[PDB]
Point group: C2
Chain length 148, copies 2
């Protein structure tokens, strides 16, 4: 499983102009499910995201996690995180989990993270969205579950 | 060298409220320089980004590159792409190139890519920015030069 998390000040998803999830100061999380992915991948991941000290105050950078600052979280499906650009001009997605299983793992992932007790919005799965991100810093981190 | 590229419809960087780079339909590129990085890493990278068929029309997805659609490019420095979250709650950046060399490789990278002939904006290097991204799709791709 993989994730691109961007520290945001404001961030939301809208479909056809209708916003379907919004957050203020917090984290935007791009989620990509991998063939192979399991419940443990969700764990090993949902964890590092919640305790990542990427937030700062005026005294030091990288000292507070999303929980610490009690921030908001926005999860957005992104099967393209397992893109293979090794050959053609066109990217491959052999490692990307099939949509059905993927939605599954996706919903479980979002459920696990709501356990943080934080406000967690989401995007829509299976269709196109216009994701609005205001990356403060900017701060972007990549994390794979097969690596944690 | 590493990059997180997000297909955008609109995207800009602003410092203290003063926009310092803007683009309309095109690509937002997050750049992270690695200790080790060389001129060839810039090549092996600047290339895959320019020919990536991630743009679509109404007849098929993933068929046009930034050049193909003659899109705009926005490069934003992001040393955090080489973040190590393997141990503590706090991320490590051992692999991130030192700032001085990094700015260097950064400027060369942006120069190489301007050779595409496309409109290429940039952010400011060395200080904080508020990066505005409107990811259409959304479409996000990760690419390392040590992998291409």
């Amino acid at each position: 499983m993989r994730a691109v998390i961007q520290r945001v000040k404001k961030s939301w998803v809208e479909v056809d102009g209708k916003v379907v999830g919004s957050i203020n100061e917090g984290l935007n999380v791009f989620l990509g499910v991998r063939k192979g992915d399991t419940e443990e991948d969700i764990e090993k991941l949902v964890n590092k995201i919640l305790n990542l000290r990427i937030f700062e105050d005026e005294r030091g950078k990288f000292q507070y996690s999303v929980l610490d600052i009690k921030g908001e979280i926005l999860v957005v499906s992104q099967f393209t995180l397992y893109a293979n650009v090794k050959k053609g001009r066109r990217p491959s997605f052999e490692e990307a989990e099939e949509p059905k299983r993927a939605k599954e793992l996706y919903e479980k992932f979002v459920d696990k993270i709501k356990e943080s007790g934080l406000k967690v919005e989401t995007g829509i799965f299976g269709a196109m969205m216009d994701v609005f991100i205001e990356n403060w810093g900017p701060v972007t981190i990549i994390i794979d579950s097969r690596e944690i």
